[PDB]
Amino acid sequence: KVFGRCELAAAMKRHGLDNYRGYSLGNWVCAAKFESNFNTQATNRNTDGSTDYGILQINSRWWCNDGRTPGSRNLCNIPCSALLSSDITASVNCAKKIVSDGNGMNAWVAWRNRCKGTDVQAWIRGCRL
Ligand SMILES: [Br-]
Ligand SMILES: [Cl-]
Ligand SMILES: [Cl-]
Ligand SMILES: [Cl-]
Ligand SMILES: [Cl-]
Ligand SMILES: [Cl-]
Ligand code: NA
Ligand SMILES: [Re]
Ligand SMILES: [Re]
Ligand SMILES: [Re]
Ligand SMILES: [Re]
Ligand SMILES: [Re]
Ligand SMILES: [Re]
């Protein structure tokens, strides 16, 4: 599913991401924009053989199991395929674990490089929330 901006903001808010670990909703929408272009089915294979999955491009080296990333962990205790669903529950629950692990949203390189320090409120501007 390719979400619209405001639609994703509302869903992320229903799923408890607004101000989660202190990160306002716009940070999460911005991250999703630049990680996946709001496409829940986005995948990206990395040169190390791990793969990134879903709206927030969560990586199989640490967070989910895809059966083809040797020596990896599955710290979110999910199949990576769950991160591709039109329902964002699995991606949100895993993202909550990732953002709590020490480095905040810097865990998403695209967030650090394209959202951090910017007017992220613009991503939710005008949306019915
Ligand atoms: Br609902
Ligand atoms: Cl947009
Ligand atoms: Cl915001
Ligand atoms: Cl594996
Ligand atoms: Cl394969
Ligand atoms: Cl699995
Ligand atoms: Na894994
Ligand atoms: Re909803
Ligand atoms: Re909010
Ligand atoms: Re690995
Ligand atoms: Re943080
Ligand atoms: Re701001
Ligand atoms: Re809401």
Picking from 31, 21, 26, the residue whose alpha carbon sits closest to that of residue 10 is: 26
Please identify which of the residues 7, 48, 52, 87 carries the catalytic annotation: 52
DSSP 59: E
Ligand approaching nearest to the C-alpha of 24: 3
Resolution in A: 1.1
7 is catalytic: no
State the structure-solving technique.
Answer: X-ray
| 65 CA to centre of ligand 10 in angstroms | 12
Identify the domain containing residue 57 by its residue range: 1-129
Contact yes or no for 23/124 (Cβ under 8 A): no
| 60 CA to centre of ligand 5 in angstroms | 13
| Spatial distance between the Cα atoms of 9 and 5, rounded to a whole number of angstroms | 6
Question: Which CATH number belongs to the domain containing residue 64 in this structure?
Answer: 1.10.530.10
How does strand 43-45 pair with strand 58-59?
unpaired
| Spatial distance between the Cα atoms of 46 and 24, rounded to a whole number of angstroms | 29
Buried b (16+ CB within 10 A) or exposed e, 96-110: eebbeeeebbebbeb
| Spatial distance between the Cα atoms of 15 and 55, rounded to a whole number of angstroms | 14
| 25 CA to centre of ligand 10 in angstroms | 32
| Spatial distance between the Cα atoms of 51 and 53, rounded to a whole number of angstroms | 6
Contacts of 117 (CB under 8 A, 6+ apart): none
What is the longest distance spanned by two Cα atoms in the chain?
Answer: 45
Q: Is 119 annotated as a binding residue?
A: no
Please identify which of the residues 7, 35, 66, 87 carries the catalytic annotation: 35
**Residues counted in the chain:** 129
52 is catalytic: yes
Q: For 96-99, which contacts have Cβ atoms below 8 Å and span 24 or more sequence positions?
A: 96/16, 96/17, 96/20, 96/21, 97/63, 98/58, 98/63, 99/20, 99/21, 99/23
| Spatial distance between the Cα atoms of 13 and 36, rounded to a whole number of angstroms | 18
Contacts of 15 (CB under 8 A, 6+ apart): 88, 89, 92
Number of domains in the chain: 1
Query: Residue 70: left if φ>0, alpha if ψ -120 to 50, beta else—which one?
Result: beta
* Dihedral sign computed on CA atoms, order 126, 53, 88, 97: negative
